[PDB]
Amino acid sequence: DELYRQSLEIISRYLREQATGAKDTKPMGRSGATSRKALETLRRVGDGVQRNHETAFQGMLRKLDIKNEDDVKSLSRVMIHVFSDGVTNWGRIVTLISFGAFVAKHLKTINQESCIEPLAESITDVLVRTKRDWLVKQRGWDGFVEFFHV
Ligand SMILES: Cc1cc(OCCCc2c3n(c4c(-c5c(C)nn(C)c5C)cccc24)CCCN(Cc2cccc(C(=O)O)c2)C3=O)cc(C)c1Cl
Numbered sequence: 001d002e003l004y005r006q007s008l009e010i011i012s013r014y015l016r017e018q019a020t021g022a023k024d025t026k027p028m029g030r031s032g033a034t035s036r037k038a039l040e041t042l043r044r045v046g047d048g049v050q051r052n053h054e055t056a057f058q059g060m061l062r063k064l065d066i067k068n069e070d071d072v073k074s075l076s077r078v079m080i081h082v083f084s085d086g087v088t089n090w091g092r093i094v095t096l097i098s099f100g101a102f103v104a105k106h107l108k109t110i111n112q113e114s115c116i117e118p119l120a121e122s123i124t125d126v127l128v129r130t131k132r133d134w135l136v137k138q139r140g141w142d143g144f145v146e147f148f149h150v
Contacts, residue, residue: 018101
């Protein structure tokens with residue numbers, strides 16, 4: 001499964017970049033072109049979604065009661081509940097990743113930067129295993145970037 005690897009890489013780099021603030025060096029593996037502008041798409045749109053959804057994001061974060069990695073292994077079930085209810089679109093998916101970034105910035109504050117990698121993997125696993133076929137019909141991240149062009 002490569003869609004898992006491509007998605008995980010995009011989600012990881014965006015979350016860590018949000019958490020840290022550095023636009024990261026390093027090679028963007030393979031198929032980097034689509035992944036590069038989805039990440040660039042996430043920079044432009046995802047952070048604004050966080051601004052537009054700040055109240056419930058702060059509320060959700062306060063109720064989740066995140067402290068360590070053993071909390072992360074329980075966030076998936078709440079993620080699966082809030083996310084999988086309804087019909088699929090890219091707005092839901094960019095919202096999913098946006099709150100992951102919100103959680104990532106919080107995790108750094110409480111000095112829990114090592115937990116950003118499970119989160120992104122939990123996010124990635126929740127997305128593909130529930131939206132795989134749809135992501136294939138939408139041509140994956142190509143249809144993502146095509147959707148969010150400016
Ligand atoms: C990383 C992580 C992520 C998690 O979940 C990510 C799911 C994304 C998400 C959604 N919602 C969220 C809320 C929220 C709000 C807003 N109000 N209330 C009451 C709540 C609960 C708070 C947080 C996240 C979400 C509510 C409605 C917005 N949609 C559907 C939708 C449909 C159509 C158009 C749009 C559009 O805006 O374009 C959006 C969501 O799927 C969970 C965990 C545990 C973790 Cl650790």
